[PDB]
Design a protein around this ligand. Structure first.
Ligand code: TRP
Lengths: 271, 236
């Protein structure tokens, strides 16, 4: 098993050179679940984070016009996968943020091409942001609110794949759950309205194409929004009918948590 | 593979650098019918670049700056020499600035170049046939697409040229840490990093105290060789 650890060190060293990087990316991304301290080793070694950023930026010419191939996508997504581990680790999270690394991912979140290489690119990039907000750190939310992350998420919640919609809605949910996040989104009618309009569209979609995990997050978002008095007033007058009738009764019987959340939502809107 | 311009193919001293590289597809229906409207194209592109270059340059440097400063300070924390750091920072900053510039300007350039042409074409021809306005919109969309890489490159290079000196200014204190230490007869080493590397990092991947080994610099050399948008360098 000592041979295992030395393979890892070697791959990490082999990330700096473009000659050996692609294979090292592949191998490291496979073992990121079995190597607990992978993230600090990547962060604190020479040139490693720089190489991962390099992989990201070198994809930019293939974004617009959209020409990204499966091969290009698979490679950068291996890099993105390693950045997700760095974003998640309590030892590297703060430094990852201070270096503003998420900003170099936003161009990927902005793509709209519906080909498989781009959808995987977007989903893997969302996964990095997802890893960030799962730590429930206030510094993360404040950083995200400084950036254009919310309209990026809203576009994906509107038009993305089921998976991408779910991760993006989860990101929105985490932001909303933060007191600062809620106040930000409810600061203007325009901001709130845009969010509410997207959730409404999603609810309609969900009535035609069921998704338990996406519905859960949508419901949680509405529930959190109703903690804000102005949002509560607006939701009294514009909550989707499908959330008030039996449209989701069947799918929700197995989902006790979401069920309680929806009932709590309805209860809030009466008061 | 599809990059058609090298970094030196484009002079960005003035907007006149754009002129020789403008491409006018002769098959454009608006041009077959009105060959004279080709004249309006050059100014349209120059105007589009002129209006976008400064905010794009400012925004791209601002975004790239923080990321490059943090990573370079981190990588070179046990390097008492300023020279290796300054060169690496130079290459990383110019590269990430070029990348952010490309991402920032391409869609706005399309919108702007098209608009400018639709306006020029509508102005030159006061007539407005429903068929001709379709030709005008079509021509403007085509021309924009065909000239976006050129315009983008112009703005990227403008951004790259300005990025270097801005990075120097940002790293002033890092250069001063190392200068101050040397004049005290000691090498500079970040105390926190020194401790961490010695205690926590496996020997095989540990930062070395003092200079960094040449093979490890490979990633920084690549930033120099391979800049996004340009052909790589060759030997209520
Ligand atoms: N700058 C935009 C960003 C934005 C769009 N839609 C939003 C919804 C919520 C919060 C922010 C946004 C705004 O605040 O309007």
């Amino acid at each position: 098993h000592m041979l295992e650890r030395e393979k890892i060190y070697q791959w990490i060293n082999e990330l700096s050179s473009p000659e050996t990087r692609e294979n090292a990316l592949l191998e490291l991304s496979k073992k990121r679940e079995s190597v607990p301290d992978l993230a600090p080793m990547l962060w604190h070694s020479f040139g490693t984070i720089a190489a991962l950023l390099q992989e990201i930026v070198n994809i930019y010419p293939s974004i617009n016009p959209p020409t990204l191939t499966a091969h290009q996508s698979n490679r950068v997504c291996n890099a993105l996968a390693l950045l997700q581990c760095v974003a998640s680790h309590p030892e590297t999270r703060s430094a990852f943020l201070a270096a503003h690394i998420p900003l170099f991912l936003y161009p990927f979140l902005h793509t709209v091409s519906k080909t498989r290489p781009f959808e995987y690119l977007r989903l893997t990039s969302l996964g990095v942001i997802g890893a960030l907000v799962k730590t429930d750190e206030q510094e993360v939310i404040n950083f995200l609110l400084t950036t254009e992350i919310i309209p990026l998420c809203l576009r994906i919640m509107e038009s993305g794949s089921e998976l991408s919609k779910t991760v993006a809605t989860f990101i929105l949910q985490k932001i909303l759950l933060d007191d600062t996040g809620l106040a930000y989104i409810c600061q203007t009618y325009e901001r709130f309205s845009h969010v509410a309009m997207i959730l409404g569209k999603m609810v309609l979609q969900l009535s035609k194409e069921p998704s338990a995990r996406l519905l859960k997050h949508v419901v949680r978002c509405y529930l959190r929004l109703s903690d804000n008095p102005r949002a509560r007033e607006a939701l009294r007058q514009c909550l989707p009918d499908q959330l008030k009738d039996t449209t989701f009764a069947q799918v929700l019987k197995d989902d006790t948590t979401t069920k309680r959340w929806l009932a709590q939502l309805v209860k809030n809107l009466q008061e | 593979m599809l990059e058609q311009y090298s970094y030196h193919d484009i002079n960005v001293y003035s907007l006149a650098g754009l002129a020789p590289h403008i491409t006018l597809n002769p098959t454009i229906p608006l041009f077959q019918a009105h060959p004279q409207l080709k004249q309006c194209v050059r100014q349209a592109i120059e105007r589009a670049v002129q209006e976008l270059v400064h905010p794009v340059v400012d925004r791209s440097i601002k975004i790239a700056m923080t990321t490059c400063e943090q990573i370079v300070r981190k990588d070179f924390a046990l390097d008492s020499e300023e020279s290796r750091m300054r060169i690496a920072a130079h290459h990383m900053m110019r590269n990430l600035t070029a990348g952010m510039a490309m991402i920032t300007c391409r869609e706005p350039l399309l919108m702007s170049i098209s608009t400018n042409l639709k306006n020029s074409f509508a102005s030159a021809l006061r007539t407005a046939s429903p068929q001709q306005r379709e030709m005008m919109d079509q021509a403007a969309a085509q021309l924009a697409q065909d000239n976006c890489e050129l315009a983008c490159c112009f703005i990227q290079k403008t951004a790259v040229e300005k990025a270097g000196p801005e990075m120097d200014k940002r790293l002033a204190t890092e250069f001063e840490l190392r200068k101050h230490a040397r004049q005290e007869g000691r090498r500079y080493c970040d105390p926190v990093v020194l401790t961490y590397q010695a205690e926590r990092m496996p020997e095989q991947i540990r930062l070395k105290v003092g200079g960094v080994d040449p093979k490890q610099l490979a990633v920084y050399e690549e930033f120099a060789r391979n800049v996004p948008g340009f052909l790589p360098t060759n030997d209520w």
